[PDB]
């Protein structure tokens, strides 16, 4: 009986109808597609199950779709969402491989498609490098899956070959020293895909890790590499895109410290606060709120980034992971300097914000002003909330 699979049939039927509707709308010469975007958001809601993580991903992708305008980009983001959703439910390396590869192909094509102006060739260059680096990591995953399949005779993810699969997962999160594909991507690709790349796949992969993964090894050297390299790199790079790429490497090192000491509640709290800050960061038009992102990414006390860092520090001290904790505290002391550089650049400066001329007047002030109210979330964060 197939009566337990109506959501899958609904997914496929919705894709079949959406392609035909997008074709009919384009035969009329419509230069805007807000109706297509609303149908895409409805389809996103209709295929998502009733778990916390699934709906967090769903609501995140509904918010992200407001920064994309063409039909093909919307289709690629939907088919990347299918991989992102179904990776959280993957209990093998077969589905794991297919979901990861679908996401990689969608990201590569979007990086090629959306570039404009003088930065087109730089974006295509960085997309090619990302594709080549992704191909060999995919080959490593397939090779060691074949080794595990031959040794165990089954699809269980146990044994020594899980160390290389773990390295595949660490590549997909931009963990140093395999971090330079993300550093290349941050310097050229436009802001909407940078917003997409810093939020949704990290959530999808960490939920797969929380749900169906065990390894008998450690990730401590990659924690050290990510934290020290990210902090020193963001201290040393004057371009703002490289600053935010290296600060992202530092944040993924903190999330790996939360993974390594168990306690995924602190991981989920810090990831949620980080995702809301990212949603504020890449949609800013008034540059004074760039200082709020700075004080809430430096871990300064009353804002929500402090709470996200401080439960990670608390659980690390609870299980006595002293050396990694000391390295994390040193890199936190270093991170403050370049977040202060951000504050010097964009707060202690005269205010200029250009008006719109061709309509759409400051079109994402709702989301940015809503996400700035991360100064009111700390009242709920101090309680036993995320567990």
């Amino acid at each position: 009986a197939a009566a337990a699979a109506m959501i899958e049939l609904d997914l496929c039927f919705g894709l079949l109808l959406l392609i035909l509707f997008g074709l009919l709308s384009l035969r009329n010469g419509h230069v805007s597609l807000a109706h297509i975007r609303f149908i895409c958001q409805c389809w996103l809601v209709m295929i998502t199950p009733l778990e916390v993580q699934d709906f967090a991903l769903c609501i995140l992708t509904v918010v992200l779709l407001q920064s994309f305008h063409s039909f093909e980009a919307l289709l690629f983001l939907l088919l990347a969402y299918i991989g992102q959703l179904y990776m959280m439910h993957s209990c093998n390396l077969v589905s794991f491989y297919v979901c990861l590869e679908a996401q990689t192909l969608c990201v590569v094509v979007l990086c090629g498609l959306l570039a404009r102006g003088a930065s087109t060739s730089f974006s295509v260059e960085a997309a090619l490098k990302f594709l080549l680096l992704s191909a060999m990591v995919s080959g490593m995953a397939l090779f060691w899956f074949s080794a595990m399949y031959q040794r165990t005779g089954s699809l269980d993810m146990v044994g020594q070959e899980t160390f290389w699969i773990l390295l595949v997962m660490l590549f997909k999160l931009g963990v140093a020293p395999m971090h330079m594909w993300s550093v290349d991507l941050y310097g050229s690709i436009p802001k909407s895909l940078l917003l997409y790349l810093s939020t949704a796949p990290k959530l999808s992969l960490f939920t797969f890790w929380a749900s169906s993964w065990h390894h008998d090894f450690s990730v401590g050297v990659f924690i050290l590499f990510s934290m020290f390299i990210g902090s020193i790199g963001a201290y040393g790079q004057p371009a703002l895109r490289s600053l935010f790429a290296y600060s992202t490497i530092n944040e993924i090192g903190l999330l790996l410290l939360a993974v390594e000491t168990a306690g995924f509640h602190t991981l989920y709290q810090h990831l949620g606060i980080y995702i809301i800050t990212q949603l504020l960061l890449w949609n800013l038009t008034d540059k004074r709120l760039f200082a709020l992102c700075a004080v809430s990414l430096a871990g300064l006390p009353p804002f929500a980034g402090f709470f996200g860092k401080a439960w990670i520090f608390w659980h690390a001290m609870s299980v006595q992971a002293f050396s990694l904790l000391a390295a994390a505290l040193f890199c936190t002391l270093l991170s403050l300097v370049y977040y202060l550089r951000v504050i010097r650049l964009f707060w202690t400066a005269p205010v200029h914000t250009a008006a719109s001329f061709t309509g759409a007047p400051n079109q994402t002030t709702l989301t940015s002003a809503c996400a700035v109210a991360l100064a009111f979330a700390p009242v709920m964060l101090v309680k036993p909330f995320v567990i």
């Binding site: 197939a2 894709l15 079949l16 392609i19 035909l20 384009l26 035969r27």
Partner: protein
Amino acid sequence: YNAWSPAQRYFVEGDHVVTAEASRTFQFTGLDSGSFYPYVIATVIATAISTVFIVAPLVIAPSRVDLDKSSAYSVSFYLVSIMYLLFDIEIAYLFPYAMTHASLPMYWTMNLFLAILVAGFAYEWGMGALEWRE
């Protein structure tokens, strides 16, 4: 290939079977059912024949050196090649369906597969990508 174990020889003992297998004639109704071995021999023999065709006019033909005798007298192909690649993969997927006595849920799964195929194809038709004006 020859069998290397008593279990592979149906537990027949002796030395007559080993020599008889190593010096057997090729037989589709003996030990070589569905074998694809004549395809290799055909390649070797035809390569020999075409090499003899290539070499022979270098001996039995006249030749004169001249500097003028040894001289010369779009993106649609990208579309065709990539579309052919994807459609060939899809037909290769459809081939295990046609080689089975399929039940009704197999039929409806296959039709969902074909529907996704033809939906992408019809989108590229409607956007004017199969009109080869350029």
